[PDB]
Write a protein that binds this ligand. Structure first.
Ligand SMILES: O[C@@H](Cc1cccc(Cl)c1)Cn1cncn1
Ligand SMILES: O[C@@H](Cc1cccc(Cl)c1)Cn1cncn1
Lengths: 304, 304
């Protein structure tokens, strides 16, 4: 029992972190097989970041200008190429610590672990969700660029995020491992609008199921609702509309607890309309949306 | 910017996890050098756990009864001994993945990362505090015994906790790596009183400093207080009394923000007496006490 905001064990990812320096700029790179992936803005100076012409800036760079160090070991760069907003530096040595891995583009509302790094050195690991507006609310300081987000399925690391930028609002933006930004963001020092965000309804319901499993039941009521009625309330409170696909994904939790998904929706409707009345759920005084139904099942069954 | 409940990178600890089986019971062990540490209750059956005579149960066990497996590798046990509530199984092979490490007994109110494991396999990592009453509010299911808590200082892992038990209240209890329980707990299936818990005042103030650093400032007011006056409020609200030693540890945060410790205490006094008024601080709707002043500085400066 007990329910915590748990990150995946980061060991397999720590083994891939390297420091990449180009000119005056140092950030983090991900060394998988004989390729090092890093944000393309490693080739910029401060004057370049207003509106960088990345193609022109990269043309002034040669393989020997990219300094890649994996702690002690210096990697020899034998090729470089830009793919979207990432650079791929081919090195002459395959990383001996390369785990089984995939590159995946996660959907908004999905969660992942971030291994925050500085100068190629891991500093901490935390779990977070990709917001519906494609930002993440992380903990990143200057130098954290190139830190990655990931999930693990037994022995396979699915890398889903590489950190690029902090928006003037303090929220974070980055790309998949092919260098495509999540959301409308561009890698420029420019004020950029993040869309209107919403609360991830399916995750809040998954979390209410985790609360019932772990003994927090005070919010359960004698009511039920419909998808239509619940969605009117979700609309008023800036929650994502609930679909049958979300109800379907909650099936295992519904079956385990015996609480029909629409009955949990009526508990969620009452919490939205009434608040928590100074009480808590799993140590939180607000409705938590950073646990997916999969995260709840995984944690409640002890998956390794 | 951004502030998250961050755990240490778990890689160095994942390399030490093993599975230990004795009879019908399997739990986790920590393999450091040529010794495997695990909870002594690995030698019990369900009938034994009401009031185990550990000395007698261990006398029926030989080195060959302790099955230690590090994933694929089977360790040969050449010695066994009980120290307090832990067993030390001497093995014939030093763990090649043994990091630089120390065994430390942490103080109540200090924080650490837990690597939750099942059958010797890491499942997740989360940060938590040792409550003032020596319990931890973790996420542990049956089979998680032997999972450890730790901190890292550059390349040194200080192991501070080994998980043993879940109390009937759903809170968790364990020992230091010498097998001494934190708190009054015994390793028996018996209802056991945890002391009255309090909120870790110094940590809440550290967290209010992290909030000001990261842009959440709404709670700052035009007031100040004294240690005596603040401690009357801390008393009413079951907060730990604040001492000059706590004010001293907050010195760096006070210097960085320019907010005198007693002025932050007046903000904390007003939040205790008035609540949050439906607002949040660093994404929380309650006063967070799981970040020490050291954790706040480390996170706000990007220490690796
Ligand atoms: O925002 C980053 C620098 C930068 C500026 C503008 C655009 C880009 Cl792609 C990068 C630094 N940073 C990342 N997390 C916290 N700080
Ligand atoms: O409580 C543990 C079993 C047990 C019972 C009684 C005493 C002891 Cl020392 C061990 C199982 N467990 C640990 N975390 C979650 N579940």
């Amino acid at each position: 029992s007990g329910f915590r905001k748990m990150a995946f064990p980061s060991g397999k990812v720590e083994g891939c972190m390297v420091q990449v320096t180009c000119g005056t700029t140092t950030l983090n790179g991900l060394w998988l097989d004989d390729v090092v992936y890093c944000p393309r803005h490693v080739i910029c100076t401060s004057e370049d970041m207003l509106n960088p012409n990345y193609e022109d800036l990269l043309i002034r760079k040669s393989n020997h200008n990219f300094l890649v160090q994996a702690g002690n070991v210096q990697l020899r760069v034998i090729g470089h190429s830009m793919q979207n907003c990432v650079l791929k530096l081919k090195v002459d040595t395959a990383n001996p610590k390369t785990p089984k891995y995939k590159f995946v583009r996660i959907q908004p509302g999905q969660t992942f672990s971030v291994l925050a790094c500085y100068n190629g050195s891991p500093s901490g690991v935390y779990q977070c969700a990709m917001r519906p507006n494609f930002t993440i609310k992380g903990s990143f300081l200057n130098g954290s660029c190139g830190s990655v987000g990931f999930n693990i399925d037994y022995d396979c690391v699915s890398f889903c995020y590489m950190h690029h930028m902090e928006l003037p609002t303090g929220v974070h933006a980055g790309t998949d491992l092919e260098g495509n930004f999540y959301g409308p963001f561009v890698d420029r020092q420019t004020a950029q609008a993040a869309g209107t965000d919403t609360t991830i309804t399916v995750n809040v319901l998954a979390w209410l199921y985790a609360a019932v499993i772990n003994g927090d039941r005070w919010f359960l009521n004698r009511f039920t609702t419909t998808l239509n009625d619940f969605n009117l309330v979700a609309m008023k409170y800036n929650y994502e509309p609930l679909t049958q696909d979300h109800v379907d994904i909650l099936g295992p939790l519904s079956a385990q607890t015996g609480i029909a998904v629409l009955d949990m929706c009526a508990s969620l409707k009452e919490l939205l309309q009434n608040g928590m009345n100074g009480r808590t759920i799993l140590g939180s005084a607000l409705l938590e949306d950073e646990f997916t139904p999969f995260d709840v099942v995984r944690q409640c069954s002890g998956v390794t």
